[PDB]
Amino acid sequence: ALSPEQLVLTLLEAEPPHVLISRPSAPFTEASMMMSLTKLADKELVHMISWAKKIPGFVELSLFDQVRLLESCWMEVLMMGLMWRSIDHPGKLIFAPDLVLDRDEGKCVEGILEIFDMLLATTSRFRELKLQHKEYLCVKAMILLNSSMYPLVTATADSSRKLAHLLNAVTDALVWVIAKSGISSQQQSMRLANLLMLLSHVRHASNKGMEHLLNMKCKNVVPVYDLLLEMLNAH
């Protein structure tokens, strides 16, 4: 199940559905643009839980570690999906098939234009590298499995070893996919380093987005509900 060709096919079959949403009838305001983006995020979070349960070994971790990994990565995983949907469309963010925002539309919401420019620049670096679909599947699974999991004290020890074995198997799978290209050994090491250095850019953008959303919530610009509200209250 963890051998490279079987693991990559399992990740391919686990991909979540595209969630559909459209623009409002009236011109956007700061409040109505925040309402459309947060309604989409809440529904994608529900499907994200079903995706994580499909990754081999994940439901064999402690329930406590399952919850802690999703709390630590959910905004990063929403942004990685958006970047892959937008990779062939310079100057646009493809939130859904009927919600395609031009860069300049971020001028509608205070503080969001900087975050759109971060997302668009990291999308442009994956376009320049010619990121392949099977490389994307491995890097998105590494985002889930790679957070700090500094020791905490639970009322109830193999769950950490189980996590390292799973993260090692996904890393081996990405090295196997790169080796199909047949480029030089130096070029394979350089491509691996280039893809993994972009993980810090996805964490940077997710930090700025989490601050922005918590401030829009506190100031009553947008109301938030159910799963999205719970993940924010817990942060």
Binding site: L63, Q66, V67, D226, L227, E230, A234
Partner: peptide
């Protein structure tokens, strides 16, 4: 606290 996520995990 993690009230609704537990529910979807099981």
């Amino acid at each position: 606290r993690h009230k609704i996520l537990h529910r979807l995990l099981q």
